[PDB]
């Protein structure tokens, strides 16, 4: 009955309590039985307690019989099931226990029958080794207690009122004896309630908060938090706090959170408690260390609690404490960063806003964990939205006049971050997880404020700081965030012209790579041809390039005449100029200038002379790469440009190939990535869309194919630290793209698959994708190369023939072999693998006999697991073609073969 009524139906809760209270009055005994069975069945038990049992058996014996007659299918029980209909259940269960006590608190609860009965059963069940009883009963008992705390509280109040009535009459007959009588009746009532509370606490709580099962421990600590928040005057003292204190050290995150949620509840919204502050002072150390809890969910609540602590008093938190929390602003995980940002705000953030901005810049400068503001900014985005979008303010501190230049740069940095995050509406990478109405509006509002403000301020800004590289690289990124229509309709074209002038002046006095990249990338944004502004800027572009190209030819005259052997100085002159051209040719079309000649003339002259400063080579290489690529774009369209393109392309591949062996290491890398790019670009795939491009297709020699493999083996597989890695993975994927798009013979993958283990953290993820992308391409020749991998590991260990079976080398190859099998038309592959493994095992003969390669079958034995019952015969038939009778008989060193034969 009852168990059904609670989850299954959703009649009111007070309606079912009152019906139960009704029945308790008609017949106490049948109704208390309905209540016993209710708790049993909530545990998942399908047993029934009968009247005869109720009348005659002890709980211990009922509990035993109800374990026997449980009739379970799995180890499932209601409080561990998933779904909304069980979540609805658990809450209806807890609501019923609460509402039952609250509706009994004036009469029934103080009989001697009902609660003592319920308590003993819950106490006995909570002692059970059966988890469904122990878990369920503790929840029940923990709810029961919370209901009982309320009754006590009400009672306390009724005592205080009734005492105020008593005194009012002492001051002024027969109502006196009655008020005394009442005050006495009520004291008797508080006594029965302390007892029931102590029964539950000492009989259940004291044992169960410490249950082996963490889910039970969390239940207990939650409710004790609720008792301390509900009836603080009775429960907020050490003798209940200490539990929460100890449990903060619990080894489970779920339990640790509940200790923090409980505490938060005693500060928010309301408090002022000297018992609480004493405790917190005892456990402050432990709390700030939980700001770096292993569980991130737990670390947020520790910071949020350290924030609430802050409000009541700055007393407890020391310098070093707060400093630790500040550091979490640069955390990978956004929820902790935002909670630390909120703490940071309240702690250190009390025209108007200017002093707050200098404060952030100081904070950013003092913390040595980040060198850019992107994550600092995002942490604060939520709680300091207004201060961050105040661009007029920030703009004024860099111009109108003090500020050290270190401070001017950090404010320039911060300023840009605010803007980008206002303009694009996502967090920085790794902080993300869209996009609502009012967000699109604030976005539009934000771009316009920005565009308008910075159309005018930006030219003055470049002017002021133009000689500093960090600052300009930062400033130059602004226009990429503008709504550009606002240049025409805002009638701002005088400022636009002014901007270009600064950019041009910058491009020409700078030779830093990042400066020139910003310039180039910024000119690209401003040369958009959906905007009226284009033509003004296109002219500005054309003129700067005319100057660069013309100066480039002249430098290339004195530089490449024979008489003058140009020194370190004459060179930089060229480099400086070449960089600017290379930077611009990437982002901008620049076809009109046939500078393939100039670059080619400069690369071929490096080859013959063998002395050409690396940086010139690198940028030459890069530049001619863009020259080729831009020509490939305009193809309306001629065939004399097309046949000439093929010339340059074919020739450039030959240069990149010479430079691939050039003694200079960074030059090799430069020539290698360009090559992997073009090989992919001019691959057979070039024509997939169109067929106009069949003459351009390029397939590399078997010579070039190996050299690209030589490079990878010398430079990716070798014996800031993160820098050298990301470069190497980049070179690796470059070659692997050639593989999984079959620009290069799949055999090459043998020398790369073998490394999946030996470099599993550096290169693991890349190598795995290469293997899948070749399973999806050709399941069969994948499997061929997979064995040739192990074959290569094997022949290598020979030069280090036989043998140590118990070797670390050999044990490692079997390890790698076990892992190539889990990777496994679906069975003709493993067919192909055992064939080649067997063919390889008997490749060379012994000369007194086992053939030399015979150990390979202990490796090949790792794959006989995978497939297959009919195919094992066909494999063995193929094995017999190799193995002889006098072999199948020898059982002495021959063990690999005897091994492989099982399956």
């Amino acid at each position: 009955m009852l168990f059904e009524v609670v989850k299954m139906g959703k009649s009111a809760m007070q309606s079912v309590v009152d019906d139960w209270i009704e029945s308790y009055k008609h017949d106490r005994d049948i109704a208390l039985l309905d209540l016993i069975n209710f708790f049993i069945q909530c545990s998942g038990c399908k047993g029934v307690v009968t009247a005869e049992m109720f009348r005659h058996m002890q709980n211990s014996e009922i509990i035993r019989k109800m374990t026997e007659e449980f009739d379970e299918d799995s180890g499932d029980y209601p409080l561990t099931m998933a779904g909304p209909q069980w979540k609805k259940f658990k809450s209806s269960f807890c609501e019923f226990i609460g509402v039952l006590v609250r509706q009994c608190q004036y009469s029934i609860i103080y009989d001697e029958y009902m609660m003592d009965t319920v308590i003993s059963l819950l106490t006995g069940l909570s002692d059970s080794q059966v988890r469904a009883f122990r878990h369920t009963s503790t929840l029940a008992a923990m709810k029961l207690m919370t209901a009982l705390v309320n009754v006590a509280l009400n009672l306390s109040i009724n005592m205080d009122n009734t005492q105020r009535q008593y005194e009012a009459e002492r001051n002024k007959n027969e109502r006196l004896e009655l008020l005394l009588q009442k005050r006495k009746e009520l004291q008797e009532n508080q006594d029965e309630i302390e007892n029931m509370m102590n029964a539950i606490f000492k009989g259940v709580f004291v044992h169960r908060y410490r249950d082996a099962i963490a889910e039970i421990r969390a239940i207990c600590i939650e409710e004790i938090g609720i008792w301390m928040k509900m009836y603080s005057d009775a429960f907020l003292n050490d003798s209940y706090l200490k539990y929460v204190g100890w449990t903060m050290h619990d080894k489970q995150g779920e339990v640790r959170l509940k200790c923090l949620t409980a505490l938060q509840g005693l500060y928010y919204n309301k408090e002022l408690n000297s018992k609480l502050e004493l405790f917190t002072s005892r456990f402050k150390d432990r709390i700030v260390s939980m700001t770096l809890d292993k569980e991130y969910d737990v670390a947020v609540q520790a910071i949020k609690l350290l924030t609430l602590v802050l409000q009541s008093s700055e007393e407890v938190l020391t310098a070093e404490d707060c400093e630790n929390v500040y550091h979490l602003v640069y955390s990978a995980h956004r929820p902790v960063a935002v909670a630390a940002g909120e703490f940071l705000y309240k702690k250190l953030f009390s025209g108007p806003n200017a002093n707050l901005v200098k404060t952030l810049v100081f904070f950013f400068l003092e913390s040595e964990l980040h060198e850019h503001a992107a994550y600092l900014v995002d942490s604060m985005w939520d709680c300091a939205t207004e201060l961050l979008k105040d661009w007029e303010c920030m703009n004024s501190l860099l111009l109108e006049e003090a500020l050290t230049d270190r401070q001017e740069s950090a404010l320039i940095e911060i300023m840009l971050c605010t803007i980008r995050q206002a303009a694009e509406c996502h967090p920085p990478v790794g902080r993300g997880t869209v996009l609502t109405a009012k967000e699109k509006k604030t976005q539009l509002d934000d771009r316009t404020k920005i565009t308008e403000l910075f159309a005018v301020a930006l030219p003055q800004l470049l002017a002021k700081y133009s000689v500093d590289a960090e600052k300009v690289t930062n400033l130059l990124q602004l226009p990429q965030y503008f709504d550009l229509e606002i240049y025409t309709t805002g009638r701002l074209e005088k400022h636009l012209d002014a901007l270009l002038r600064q950019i041009r002046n910058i491009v020409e006095k700078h030779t830093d790579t990042d400066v020139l990249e910003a310039c180039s990338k910024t000119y690209h944004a401003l040369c958009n041809e959906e905007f009226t502004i284009f033509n003004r800027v296109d002219i500005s572009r054309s003129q700067l390039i005319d100057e660069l190209a013309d100066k480039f030819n002249r430098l290339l005259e004195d530089f490449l005449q024979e008489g003058e052997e140009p020194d370190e100085d004459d060179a930089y002159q060229v480099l400086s100029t070449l960089k600017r051209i290379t930077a611009f040719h990437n982002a901008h079309d620049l076809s009109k200038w046939d500078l393939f000649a100039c670059n080619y003339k400069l690369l071929k002259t490096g080859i013959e002379n063998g002395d050409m400063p690396e940086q010139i080579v690198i940028h030459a290489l890069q530049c001619t790469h863009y020259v080729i690529l831009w020509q490939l774009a305009k193809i309306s369209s001629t065939k004399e440009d097309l046949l000439r393109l093929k010339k340059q392309m074919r020739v450039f591949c030959q240069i990149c190939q010479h430079y691939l062996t050039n003694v200079n290491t960074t030059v090799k890398e430069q020539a290698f990535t360009i090559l992997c790019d073009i090989l992919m670009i001019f691959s057979h795939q070039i024509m997939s869309g169109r067929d106009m491009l069949e003459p351009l297709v390029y397939t590399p020699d078997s010579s070039l194919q190996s050299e690209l493999l030589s490079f990878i083996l010398d430079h990716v597989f070798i014996e800031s630290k993160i820098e050298a890695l990301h470069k190497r993975r980049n070179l690796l994927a470059a070659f692997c793209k050639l593989i999984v798009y079959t620009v290069v013979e799949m055999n090459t993958a043998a020398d790369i698959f073998k490394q999946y283990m030996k470099y599993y953290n550096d290169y693991g993820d890349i190598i795995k994708e290469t293997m899948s992308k070749t399973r999806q391409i050709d399941k069969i020749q994948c499997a061929k190369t997979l064995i040739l991998s192990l074959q290569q590991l094997f022949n290598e260990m020979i030069q280090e023939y036989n043998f140590d079976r118990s070797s670390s080398t050999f044990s490692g190859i079997k390890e790698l072999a076990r892992r190539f099998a889990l990777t496994f038309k679906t069975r003709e592959a493993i067919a192909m693998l055992h064939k080649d493994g067997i063919e390889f095992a008997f490749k060379e003969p012994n000369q007194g006999e086992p053939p030399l390669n015979l150990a390979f079958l202990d490796i090949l034995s790792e794959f006989s697991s995978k497939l297959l019952r009919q195919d094992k015969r066909t494999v063995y038939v193929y094995l017999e073609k190799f193995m002889t009778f006098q072999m199948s008989l020898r059982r002495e060193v021959w063990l690999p073969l005897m091994s492989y034969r099982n399956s």
């Binding site: 100890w246 955390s331 990437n586 990535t673 993160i722």
Partner: protein
């Protein structure tokens, strides 16, 4: 052999609570930083196997050049 979960040990020893209080190093960690430099921040955006197999080795700044690479990529 009953599928019903029965626990042989229901409570954590008192001695072992004392031990939890005195050493919580295994449930505490070091601060996991976000990318601390603009380089490392691009690399995080532009790294991963998916992002790596879908872009040139030598970065292309104009989408006009980039399609020339990307066009050879999704087919098979």
């Amino acid at each position: 052999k009953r599928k019903l979960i029965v626990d042989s040990v229901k409570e954590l020893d008192s001695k072992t609570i004392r031990a939890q209080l005195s050493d919580y190093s295994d449930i505490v960690t070091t601060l996991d930083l976000a990318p601390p430099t603009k380089k490392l921040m691009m690399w995080k955006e532009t790294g991963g196997v998916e992002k790596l197999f879908s872009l040139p080795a030598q970065p292309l700044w104009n989408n006009r050049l980039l399609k020339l690479f990307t066009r050879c990529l999704t087919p098979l």
